[PDB]
Design a protein around this ligand. Structure first.
Ligand SMILES: O=c1nc[nH]c2scc(-c3cccs3)c12
Ligand SMILES: [Cl-]
Length: 192
């Protein structure tokens, strides 16, 4: 019933995405970033993270990285699935992404899962080891949903990232554009 409710939720989001994110215009595209960044900001506010990095990658993938605890990976009571999978298959961003990947650094282990339109492509796996903790989310917005544009605007991202860093003092928030490998731009914000 839990996994069935998962699937019904992804169907709902993709049927009326503007009810979830405001619009499917350029403003809704950028909203995807804000939803992921806000989760990392909560982790900083909780006392566990202090660095967030937003990267516009080739082909308008977005990568958000924080140094928090790592999304948990323990098997749940409710779903019988790893906690990170439950969290990400209930995420609006995941539903509205043609592809999304997570890497969790936790328990000295690197865990990976990938999804398409919110559907896990394989079970969460251990892919490597680590001496850090935190979370990496990489997504590509689904052009079937975002029919006007899937191209991010650096200055739109920059203006809100700067605002977030100013509002959440002590969090280092970095924006980087890698879409043109020949001219990479980066702004990094860290108040007080
Ligand atoms: O730490 C996080 N970074 C990004 N997204 C999420 S969603 C849930 C969490 C965490 C909950 C508890 C530890 S990490 C995070
Ligand atoms: Cl865990």
């Amino acid at each position: 019933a839990g996994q069935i409710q998962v699937l019904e939720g992804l169907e709902a989001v993709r049927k009326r995405p503007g009810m979830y994110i405001g619009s499917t215009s350029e403003r809704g595209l950028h909203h995807l970033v804000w939803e992921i960044v806000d989760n990392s900001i909560d982790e900083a506010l909780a006392g566990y993270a202090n660095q967030i990095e937003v990267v516009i990658e080739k082909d308008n993938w977005i990568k958000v990285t924080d140094n928090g605890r790592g999304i948990p990976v323990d098997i749940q009571e409710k779903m019988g699935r790893p906690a990170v999978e439950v969290i990400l298959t209930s995420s609006v961003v995941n539903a509205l992404s043609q592809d999304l990947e997570v890497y969790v650094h936790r328990n000295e282990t690197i865990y990976h899962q990938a999804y398409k339109k919110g559907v896990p492509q394989f079970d969460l796996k251990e892919v490597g080891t680590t001496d850090k903790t935190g979370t990496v989310i990489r997504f590509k917005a689904d052009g079937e949903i975002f029919t006007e544009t899937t191209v991010y605007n650096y200055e739109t991202l920059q203006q809100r990232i700067r605002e977030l860093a100013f509002l959440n003092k002590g969090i280092q928030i970095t924006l980087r554009d890698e879409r043109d490998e020949e001219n990479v731009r980066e702004d990094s914000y860290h108040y007080e």
